[PDB]
Amino acid sequence: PTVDAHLANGSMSEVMMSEIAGLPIPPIIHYGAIAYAPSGASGKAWHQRTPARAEQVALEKCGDKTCKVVSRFTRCGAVAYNGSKYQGGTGLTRRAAEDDAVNRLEGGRIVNWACN
């Protein structure tokens, strides 16, 4: 029997998950770091997909390959400056990070931050 022979295409769905089906979204753990040498060398990287890359990029922006005092977090980090003292707070959210930063550092103020 002579059948119809044509490839089957259609209209693909541009949707990813839904509300009808789509479990409450667990956080997307991104990896980041803020490399801050007391020298004033600051660098930050966030929303990375690999801890190694994040760390490398943090060191990259800091400037030193071996930039230490690097804060590595998969949360949000907030760096406060207090008269040449640099303190980095950490919280899942920037609100919690600023809260932690100001918990650990008072007197000064948060001027740098980066959230994953």
Q: What are the boundaries of each domain within the chain?
A: 27-74, 78-111
Contacts within 8 Å (CB) and 24+ apart, 9-17: none
For residue 9, give Cα distances in angstroms to 2, 6, 75.
21, 9, 43
Structural element, H or E, at residue 52 = helix 51-62
Listed in sequence order, the residues at least 6 apart from 82 whose beta carbon sits closer than 8 Å to its beta carbon are 105, 106, 107, 108, 109
